[PDB]
Each structure stands twice: as C-alpha cells, then as structure tokens.
C-alpha cells in the first residue's frame, strides 16, 4: 500500500475493473503535470477506506459504486465536490444525483453498471426468457456434460436481480427520502425469488459454493452455457475463444429481473492534501473521450456518465444490453445504512443457500441485522487553523522484529521515504541492558539532515554519503550503502549479521529504536504489512491525523466534546496531551477517550475538563492513582451519542488512530 504524499496521487479501485487503463491515464497525467499516479486494487477496499482515511493515509481518490459513499460522507471522510457549471453540464444529471448526499456532491460519477445475462451462442443460440425454464434446460445440458447457469452466489449483488424481481427492495423511497425503518428484504416477493434460488441449488442445478472465479472460469472454458456479470467481465471473455452474447436477464413470475444499478464513482479523500490535483485529474483527464476510452479498452465500464463518449459507447450492443437491464432495475440508495444492509443480505443468502437457515428465518434475520445505529450528526473535516493532532505510534507500513540468539552482531534496517525536498529527521538508538556490536543500515528516498543519537552503542553505519547529512557526524564507523532493491539490501545486510528489526517508514519526523526489546520468539525477520513493532520501534510521522467535528442539534448551551478513538494486543498505556488555546476563563469541555479493553489512558491537559474513558485513566500528575473508566459505545456514532448525553452541543475534535503511544491534540 502506497501512503499519501503531497505532490502525488494514490488511487484505489476494485480488482475487477480496468485499473490498467486507469493507470495509463495516470501516466498521461504524470507526463503533463509531473504528478505521479499510483493505481492499486486492495481486497475489500470499500471496507478498508473508512478505517484508513481517519488515520490520515489511504488513497487520494477511491473508486467504487456510489452506494457506499454516503457512509464515507457521514463520517466526514470525503471532500465536497464543487465543479464548474460548465463541467456539470458534461455529465448526465441522474449520475450527479447518485453522488448527492445531504445536498452536497461527494464524488464524481464515472460509469453506470448493471448486471446482464451472458450466454454462449454455440451452446445456447436461443437463451431462455424466464428463470423457471432454466432447470428443464439444465437437465438437457447436463446430459451433454455441461451446466445451464453458473454465477457468483457469494455476493448478494449478483443474486439480487431475482430477489427484487417480485416486490423485493432495500429501502423504500417516498416523500423525497429513503425510509430506513422500511425494508423489503423479508417480504413475500423477496422470499419467492430467494426460495426459487434455494430450489435451484436444492435440485443441484447450481452449486452453493460457486463464486466469481468458479463461474468465470466455468463460462470461459465452455463448461456452462450461461453466467451473470457486468461490463468489466466482457474483456476476459474476449480473450477466451467463447462466442458469447449479452442480453436481458430472465423474467421471474412473469416480472423482469431488477438488478441494482451502480454508478462507478470517484471520491476525493478528505485526508488528501492533493484535493486540487485530484479534481484536475478527474475533471480534465479521466472524464474525457480519451480517458474513458483508455479505461474501457482494459475493462468495459458499461455506460459512462460522460455524454460525449456515451454517444459513442451506446453503439456497442453489449452496452445497449447493459442499459436495457439497468432500465428495469433500481439505482442503489447511497445512504450510510447501505453497508449494514449489504452485510445482512449477504449472510442471509449464504445461510439460506447453505441450508443452515430457512428462507423465512434467513430473511427475517436479514431484516433485523440490517438495522443501523442511530446517527447523531454528520461529521465534517476540520481545518488546521481549528485543530491539529500529532501522535507517535509503534505501527509501520512494513516491519519485522526478530530475536538473534548467540549473535555477536545484530543488524537493524530502516527504509525511510520522504516527499520532494530536503527533510529533517531525529533518530535515536536506545542501548539494551547488559557488549554486542550493532549495524544500522538506513536507506533514504531523498536528501535528509539527520540527528543521530547512539550512546554507548558499538555502532556501525551503512548509508549514502551524498543523501544523508549529519548534525553530528562520526568519522570512521561508516560503510557506503550499495544501490540495490530493498529485498537485496536486506540480504546484503544479513550477510553481515542477523536482522533483529526492519521497518519502512513514510516521511518520519522522529524515530526511536530500542535494542534488545525483541518481542515473542521469532528468529527470522520478515517484512509484514502494517506490522506492530511493539517496544522495538516508536516513531512520530509527519502527516497529521484527520481531525473531524460537528454540531449536535437540539443541545442547549456551549459545551465542547473532544473525542479520541484508539483502534485495535496487550496492556498499553496511551499518553494523551491536550492543549486548548484561546479557551475562556470558564470553559465547559469533556475529553472522551475510547479504546480496546487493554488500553489505559495517561492524561495531560492544560485545562480542567471532564473525563470520559474506557478501561482506566490516570493523570500525568498522579501516575499511580488509577480511576476506573466506563463502558463506552464502540462506534463513532455511538461516541457522538455519548457526547450528546453529556450535554455537548459541539464536537470540536474527533480522531481515530491505531496503536498509538503518545497523542498530542491541539484545538483553538
Ligand atoms: O454484494 C455487495 C456489494 O454490492 C455492490 O458491489 C458490486 C459493485 O457495485 C460492482 O461495481 C462490482 O464491483 O461488483 C460488486 C459486487 O461484487 C455494492 O456496490 C457494494 O457496496 C456491496 O459491497
Ligand atoms: C519517496 O517514495 C515515494 C513512494 O515510495 C515516492 O512517491 C516519492 O517520489 C519518493 N520521493 C522521492 C524524492 O523520490
């Protein structure tokens, strides 16, 4: 995972999309502006983004169907989109409606996705028009060693068209609003579609464990005559020798299959310093005939939101079929509750298809699990002038800690990466309790002025003399760092001695390295993503956390709530420093500290404020006096509600951080 860096763009998009073409567009944008663009497709990126954006990192731009973005915007994780009317006129209005949340545009619409029925012409010159005739057809095809239909059953998105065919829906829309207390997952028609699916699996016309890979591999090799998929899937079929047609989904109970219409959208991370660059890229490069053509060449986008290129794409009969099915379905709601809904429906379908539940029990349960938490406010990013949060953590982008029994020399490796320009770094090596000599290998990404503190350590240095400049240089204990890739640097260093710790740090402001603190028993040091270095390494990153806040409506008086939520495995004391500036002589404020059960809080504040925490807390002035905490809500909205209970009209600070040792908050 590439961290955010000012002057560059990170982009997340699902692994089934045309990220190759999108990266091509990024190479164009880089050529023009000199801004590099890194496109990646992490697994479950839609569930990862909300957690990662709150820490300040994550992609500058996230690509996903609109249904999720509402959630993100409720948590204050997306910047407001303010395109010029001239640009707004270039895309269809309804695609803008998809990205409308509380009157604000939260993303850019890209494409319009809808599932279609893909069939093999050689196997099925005349594909059935109804679900009901599929079984009778699968008998005939199984006689020939084939199957009628195979599509992904592990995601409710693919099976929804049949559930919704009769009276099935997610959230009823009326009076210009979605009613979150009205859900149509457990109704009769949904039960009928899902019961017909369960009847297909029950008769061995489909395999309950079939997934995306199984269905794609099966259809591309001619094992099955039919599959259900979206535009993105046509490319891999083109490579295959299969002669395929793309047409309207079958009817169920005489009614057309209603797929959920998605709108591939690009949201701009509220933690991004490159917002203006992301708007430039999305508006003037990605959304053009050329850009959308480059992406669509890799993986078809379906119908694009951009009108000029849509007028060309509609000439594709496959896109025409996508539109035909989309016209019969329902654009997904974009509300924050959709996530929960999806989870529920998922576990329902699965459990109902595996036989663990009856359709009735599975769907009733779905209706109950879809219930979402109470929302107390819409969070909003807070600017630097209002508040700033800096912290020290033990977590690293990549890291490893290991023990070296009997080793006469131990090796520590640091892969340090910095943005453009000279950077300043403080590095301190802390001696272990007692003669073992140490090797420090530090490779740097740019020029760095370094304060190295190593006291009573028989230390050897390995670095680049041209990039690293010392405030206090040593004369003799130095080795010129060879220019290898990182893995080869690790092996080169291992040729001198075993590696006890290694870490890749992005734009570190300060670093502390503790010798002889090796945790557990691990003899080989292997880099793992998002590793917790424990006591071995503690560093202060330069990028600050994402601070958020809001106003709690219907709450009298002026009372500020400052919330810090530490994210999740042993007893840990988090130091929390609070500096409130321009605070009135008498200020009513509360500090809410939420974290796992194993976290104690050590509080130091320049102001006298209420204290509301989990676990236990102690003031920095009274180390050994322990005050037991309360049981606090786990969710962000839960904590906001706890703030409302405390008569807080204004949430001044809201921060979410992982595995933090020290946390300094500042608010004015
Ligand atoms: O199944 C739950 C899932 O449904 C939708 O995800 C789609 C997505 O819209 C398509 O672009 C493509 O990636 O297929 C996905 C299903 O595998 C929702 O957009 C998503 O929020 C939800 O998790
Ligand atoms: C530092 O590394 C990051 C990612 O590895 C890269 O984007 C950036 O350009 C590098 N800095 C320099 C000065 O090359």
Curated annotation (Swiss-Prot):
<dbReference type="GO" id="GO:0034289">
    <property type="term" value="P:detection of maltose stimulus"/>
</dbReference>
<dbReference type="GO" id="GO:0030288">
    <property type="term" value="C:outer membrane-bounded periplasmic space"/>
</dbReference>
<keyword id="KW-0574">Periplasm</keyword>
<dbReference type="GO" id="GO:1901982">
    <property type="term" value="F:maltose binding"/>
</dbReference>
<dbReference type="GO" id="GO:0060326">
    <property type="term" value="P:cell chemotaxis"/>
</dbReference>
<dbReference type="GO" id="GO:0015768">
    <property type="term" value="P:maltose transport"/>
</dbReference>
<dbReference type="GO" id="GO:0042956">
    <property type="term" value="P:maltodextrin transmembrane transport"/>
</dbReference>
<dbReference type="GO" id="GO:0042597">
    <property type="term" value="C:periplasmic space"/>
</dbReference>
<dbReference type="GO" id="GO:0043190">
    <property type="term" value="C:ATP-binding cassette (ABC) transporter complex"/>
</dbReference>
<dbReference type="GO" id="GO:0016020">
    <property type="term" value="C:membrane"/>
</dbReference>
<dbReference type="InterPro" id="IPR006059">
    <property type="entry name" value="SBP"/>
</dbReference>
<protein>
    <recommendedName>
        <fullName>Maltose/maltodextrin-binding periplasmic protein</fullName>
    </recommendedName>
</protein>
<dbReference type="Pfam" id="PF01547">
    <property type="entry name" value="SBP_bac_1"/>
</dbReference>
<dbReference type="GO" id="GO:0015144">
    <property type="term" value="F:carbohydrate transmembrane transporter activity"/>
</dbReference>
<dbReference type="InterPro" id="IPR006061">
    <property type="entry name" value="SBP_1_CS"/>
</dbReference>
<comment type="subunit">
    <text>The complex is composed of two ATP-binding proteins (MalK), two transmembrane proteins (MalG and MalF) and a solute-binding protein (MalE).</text>
</comment>
<dbReference type="GO" id="GO:0055052">
    <property type="term" value="C:ATP-binding cassette (ABC) transporter complex, substrate-binding subunit-containing"/>
</dbReference>
<keyword id="KW-0813">Transport</keyword>
<keyword id="KW-0732">Signal</keyword>
<comment type="similarity">
    <text>Belongs to the bacterial solute-binding protein 1 family.</text>
</comment>
<comment type="function">
    <text>Part of the ABC transporter complex MalEFGK involved in maltose/maltodextrin import. Binds maltose and higher maltodextrins such as maltotriose.</text>
</comment>
<dbReference type="GO" id="GO:0008643">
    <property type="term" value="P:carbohydrate transport"/>
</dbReference>
<dbReference type="GO" id="GO:0006974">
    <property type="term" value="P:DNA damage response"/>
</dbReference>
<dbReference type="GO" id="GO:1990060">
    <property type="term" value="C:maltose transport complex"/>
</dbReference>
<keyword id="KW-0762">Sugar transport</keyword>
<dbReference type="InterPro" id="IPR006060">
    <property type="entry name" value="Maltose/Cyclodextrin-bd"/>
</dbReference>
């Amino acid at each position: 995972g590439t961290k955010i860096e000012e002057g560059k763009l990170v982009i997340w998009i699902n692994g089934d999309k045309g990220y190759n073409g999108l990266a091509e567009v990024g190479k164009k944008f880089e050529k023009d502006t000199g801004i590099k663009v890194t496109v990646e497709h992490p697994d479950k990126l839609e569930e990862k983004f909300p957690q990662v954006a709150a820490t300040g990192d994550g992609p500058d731009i996230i690509f996903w169907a609109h249904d999720r973005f509402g959630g993100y915007a409720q948590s204050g994780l997306l910047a407001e989109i303010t395109p010029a009317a001239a640009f707004q006129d270039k895309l269809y209005p309804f695609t803008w409606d998809a990205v409308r949340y509380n009157g604000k545009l939260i993303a850019y619409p890209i494409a319009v996705e809808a599932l279609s029925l893909i069939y093999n012409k050689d196997l099925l010159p005349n594909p059935p028009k109804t679900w009901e005739e599929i079984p009778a057809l699968d008998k005939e095809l199984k006689a020939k060693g084939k199957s009628a239909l195979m599509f992904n059953l592990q995601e409710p998105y693919f099976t929804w068209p049949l559930i919704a065919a009769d009276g099935g829906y997610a959230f009823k829309y009326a009076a210009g609003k979605y009613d979150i207390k009205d859900v149509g997952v457990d109704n009769a028609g949904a039960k009928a579609g899902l019961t017909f699916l369960v009847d297909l699996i029950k008769n061995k016309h489909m395999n309950a464990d079939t997934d995306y890979s199984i269905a794609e591999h099966a259809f591309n090799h001619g094992e099955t005559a039919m599959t259900i998929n979206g535009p993105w899937a046509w490319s891999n079929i083109d490579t295959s020798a299969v002669n395929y047609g793309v047409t309207v989904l079958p009817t169920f109970k005489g009614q057309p299959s209603k797929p959920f219409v998605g709108v591939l959208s690009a949201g701009i991370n509220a933690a991004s310093p490159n917002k203006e660059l992301a708007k430039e890229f999305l508006e003037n490069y990605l959304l053009t005939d050329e850009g959308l053509e480059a992406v669509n060449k890799d993986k078809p986008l379906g119908a694009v939101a951009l009108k000029s290129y849509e007028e060309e794409l509609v000439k594709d009969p496959r896109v025409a079929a996508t539109m035909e099915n989309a016209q019969k379905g329902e654009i997904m709601p974009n509300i924050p509750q959709m996530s929960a809904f999806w989870y529920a429906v998922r576990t329902a379908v699965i459990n109902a298809a595996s036989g663990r539940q009856t359709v009735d029990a599975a769907l009733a349960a779905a209706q109950t699990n879809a219930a979402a938490e109470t929302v107390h406010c819409d969070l909003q990013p807070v600017g630097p002038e209002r508040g700033e949060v800096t912290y020290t953590t033990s977590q690293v982008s990549k890291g490893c800690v290991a023990q070296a029994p009997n080793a006469i020399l131990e090796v520590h490796v640091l892969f340090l990466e910095f943005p453009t320009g000279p950077s300043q770094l403080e590095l301190t090596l802390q001696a272990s309790k007692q003669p073992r000599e140490v090797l420090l290998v530090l490779s740097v990404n740019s020029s760095v002025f370094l304060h190295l503190q190593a006291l009573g350590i028989p230390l050897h240095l390995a670095y680049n003399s041209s990039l690293v400049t010392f405030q206090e240089p040593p004369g003799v204990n130095t080795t010129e760092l060879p220019s290898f890739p990182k893995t080869q640097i690790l092996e080169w260093a291992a040729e001198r001695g075993p590696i006890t710790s290694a870490a890749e740090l992005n734009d570190p402001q300060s670093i502390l390295l503790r010798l002889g603190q090796a945790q557990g028993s691990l003899s080989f040091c292997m880099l793992e993503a998002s590793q917790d270095m424990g006591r071995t390494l503690e560093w202060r990153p330069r990028t600050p956390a994402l601070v958020r806040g809001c106003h709690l409506e219907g709450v009298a008086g002026h009372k500020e709530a400052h919330i810090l939520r530490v994210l999740p495995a042993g007893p840990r004391t988090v130091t929390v420093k609070v500096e409130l500036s321009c605070a009135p002589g008498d200020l009513d404020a509360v500090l809410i500290l939420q974290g796992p059960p194993y976290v104690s809080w050590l509080i130091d504040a320049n102001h006298n404020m209420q204290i509301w925490t989990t676990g236990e807390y102690s003031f920095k002035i009274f180390p050994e006096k322990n005050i037991r905490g309360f049981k606090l809500p786990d969710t962000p909205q839960g904590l906001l509600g706890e703030a409302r209970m405390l008569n807080a009209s204004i949430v001044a600070s809201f921060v979410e951080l992982p595995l933090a040792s020290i946390v300094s908050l500042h608010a004015s």
